[model samples]
Target chain A: HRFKVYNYMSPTFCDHCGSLLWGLVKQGLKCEDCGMNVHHKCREKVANLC
Target chain B: HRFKVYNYMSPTFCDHCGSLLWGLVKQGLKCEDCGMNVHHKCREKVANLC
Candidate 1:
């Protein structure tokens, strides 16, 4: 199976730190509950909100 | 709490169907093991891979 490589297209920001998610593969943890995006490191902190 | 709104970045394609994940809010299931992006509806099929 071929893995789809993701590249940066539109602007994305982190909800936890308010930082921009820049780069080819936007590395982060996307909330399953509200569809929110956050840094992988910030997942724990953001989890409380969700 | 603020929710981070994710916009389409460079190019995110689904590993399941090879469709472009283009949207302000990417609605799908991201595999925790391999980081593969898949349509919410297609998650079940992709789950087997991970």
Candidate 2:
């Protein structure tokens, strides 16, 4: 029920390999690292490129 | 609200690599080529192997 949810706002690990994400928009606000767009909060910790 | 946030479904060009997406699903749906989640209709003009 929120627009941010579909914005791939999860900060969790990569859905494909479970690796820390580079950053929220590092991969261009999209899940290029794993091909899986996750919630910004679900994304894992990684060097904050953005 | 932003319920569209959680759903990683869309048929648009990749903002990062500018590649065509494959498809989308609740799960088990990750771009095999660029690792990006797309809508079930944003696929490229490839051979309809599926």
Candidate 3:
């Protein structure tokens, strides 16, 4: 899933490493790439730091 | 979907009656039969009540 997917149980993928993500948290998806998880809203900005 | 399936809104099956579930809170799925609702994280240990 992408940023558009919302709701408690919606399937989503880690925008960071593209891992299939579940267990949605208000923060963000867990990146399988660096095991770094943050809020979805922070993804774009955080990506720049990487 | 089953107990192994864990996520905010991921599909899950009732362990007792094997029903498809959604909108999972910390409490278990809302069972249509008994009208029982609890958190998925608590389902197994709580099932003895039924």
Candidate 4:
């Protein structure tokens, strides 16, 4: 899925759960191929659509 | 024409001069339509082919 842990700069929501990444330190994950943003916990659940 | 200032996650580069968007405050601009990333200084120079 080409996912990686990252602290996204913009306010991003989880593509898997449809909720915001909840920290000012702002940690999340994104699919480098498709640009899908999400939480680390939601990584596995984020479809293999990429 | 929808280029906006954005702090992209992961390693992103300027489509203009061909360098990674530098620094911790990491910022650049991207076309919402074509997804072409570039520096603010290079924004106007980007082709409007999108």
Task: Identify the leading candidate in terms of DockQ.
Answer: 4
Off by over 4 Å in 2: A1-7, A28-35, A38-50, B1-50
Q: Which ten residues in a row have the lowest lDDT in candidate 4 chain B?
A: B22-31
Q: Candidate 3 lDDT, tens digit per residue, A1-50? A: 22333333455555555655555444354554455554565566564343
Give the winner by TM-score: 4
CAPRI rating of model 3: incorrect
DockQ of each: 0.16, 0.09, 0.21, 0.30
TM-score, A chain, model 3: 0.37
Model 1 residue A22 distance off true place after TM-score fit, in angstroms = 2.3
Q: Per-prediction TM-score of chain B? A: 0.59, 0.26, 0.36, 0.80
**Where does the lowest 10-residue lDDT sum fall in candidate 4 chain A?**
A23-32
Model 2 chain A weakest lDDT span, ten residues long: A1-10
lDDT of 1: 0.57
Writing each residue's lDDT as its tens digit, candidate 3 over B1-50 gives 12323344456555555555555443355554554544565466554444
Please tell me which predicted candidate would have the highest lDDT against the true structure: 4
How would you encode candidate 1's per-residue C-alpha lDDT over A1-50 as one tens digit per residue?
11122333456787779998766455565655566776666666643644
Ten contiguous residues with the weakest lDDT in model 3 chain B: B1-10
Query: Would you list the rank order by lDDT, best first?
Result: 4, 1, 3, 2
Model 3 local distance difference test score: 0.48
Residue-level lDDT of model 2, residues A1-50, one tens digit each, is 11122333455555435656564343323444435543355545334343
Interface RMSD of each: 5.2, 6.1, 4.1, 2.9
Per-model chain A TM: 0.61, 0.29, 0.37, 0.76
